[PDB]
Amino acid sequence: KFLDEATVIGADRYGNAWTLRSPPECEKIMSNHDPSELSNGAIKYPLDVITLQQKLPNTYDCKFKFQLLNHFFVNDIITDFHILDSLSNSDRPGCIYMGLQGTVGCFIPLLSKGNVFMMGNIENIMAEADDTFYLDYESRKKNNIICEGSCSILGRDHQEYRSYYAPVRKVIDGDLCENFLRLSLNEQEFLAKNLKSVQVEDIIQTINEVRTNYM
């Protein structure tokens, strides 16, 4: 699809879901010229770009490359994206996908620089929780939740899974952040000790904000 005029969202047979942006070097040019020029005629291309054509006739044929913008792995095969301008009067425009095995999900842009930080911190908290509990147990046996995968119930690291075919870029997993609601208060206040920042109550506020206000 197109989220935008310079960018694109996609899927794979294998489950990846990615967003590709076209570079600004190409945006200045495509903005300052009339399309008839591209095929033949004079576009003034920087010294470098041509030398990539001659040095690599196969790769740089076009001659620019998208910069991968997001990548993330959801084990379904995404059939349709639907870019919505809003969901239920929400401000943040979402793009809601739907998969083969049956699914719906959404990618919501986070417009803050402030939120993406917090949510980031919460994904990092819950991501290795099964490791943290385990280190506290080991060191509390040394001097005075038994399995290493206790909190994840299976061995998998998160980033290793959600990465899979290729590493995640900017997509922060909001379905992991949402297990934080399901823990007992003892465990929540245990995990949250890692943040100099706000208390459990404010985490839960933040996590819950997305369904209420953003969709």
């Binding site: 989220l3 084990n75 986070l110 949402e178 369904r211």
Partner: peptide, 26 residues
């Protein structure tokens, strides 16, 4: 200038591939 996305799973995948028969919880 980037794009930061947040993922949710609204409705979970429904192809049920495995089953088991017992008594798990009382």
């Amino acid at each position: 200038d980037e794009l930061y996305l947040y993922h949710l799973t609204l409705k979970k995948q429904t192809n049920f591939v495995h089953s088991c028969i017992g008594h798990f919880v009382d």
